[PDB]
């Protein structure tokens, strides 16, 4: 997953109105850059999670989550809760219904619930 | 607050009263608006009732502060996306205009967090014996 993120990074690696637009473009490029960076750091933490974990079931739980969700979004999610992303992934994977439940209903709230999810969780 | 429950309810009720291919556009708009309004009412009463349940003396007061602070819809949406939690958080809203401003400044995904984090932070885990 990191390498896929790395490819996005690799992409980065490789008159008044115009001033407003060129400026807007600079801002946009920078934004993309930062998000992607968020994505590698997210990857860094995701793999911080993955390396500290050595769990392919957690990886499998994610796989269930992955079929369910677009990865970049999950990565943004990883960005949101770097500390518990792995944990978060595990719950959802364990809870196949819950993640879709998040999708079907109030995704905005669902992410909000994600912290809670990222919460009541009593770890191991 | 009970009086102010009406203020929010009234604007909505008035629209609820209805003195507002093309017809398909119409149906979509109307129904959606109506659903949103019903939600707002669940919320309006809730915003007000829960606030009453708190009864902290400045609810409505602060409401103004927050309302002025932010586009009303944001908060309203927040109410939608928050139970009593909401109004209490509205309370907090007034509780922190600059902080709130920071909360506002933060991007939309971040915004969730703002609300998010605040909510539990802002609630009542009970106690034992």
Residue numbers in the entry:
A (entry chain A): 72 to 85, 139 to 248
B (entry chain B): 69 to 88, 144 to 252
Publication passage describing the model:
Tailed double-stranded DNA (dsDNA) bacteriophages and their eukaryotic counterparts, such as herpesviruses, possess a dodecameric portal at a unique vertex of the capsid; this portal serves as a channel for DNA packaging during viral assembly and delivery. The P22 procapsid consists of an icosahedral coat comprising 415 coat protein (gene product [gp] 5) subunits, a dodecameric ring comprising portal protein (gp1) subunits located at a unique capsid vertex, and an internal core comprising approximately 250–300 SP (gp8) subunits and 3 ejection proteins.
The two base domains likely interacted through electrostatic interactions. Furthermore, each nodule interacted with the portal through the stacking of the inner base on a loop (residues 495–504) of the portal wing. Local reconstruction of the side nodule and stalk-like structure revealed that the side nodule comprised two copies of the base domain, whereas the stalk comprised the column domain, which connected one of the two base domains in the side nodule. The SP dimer primarily forms through interactions between two copies of the same α-helix (residues 231–245) within the base domains; this explains why a recombinant SP fragment (residues 238–303) weakly self-associates into dimers.
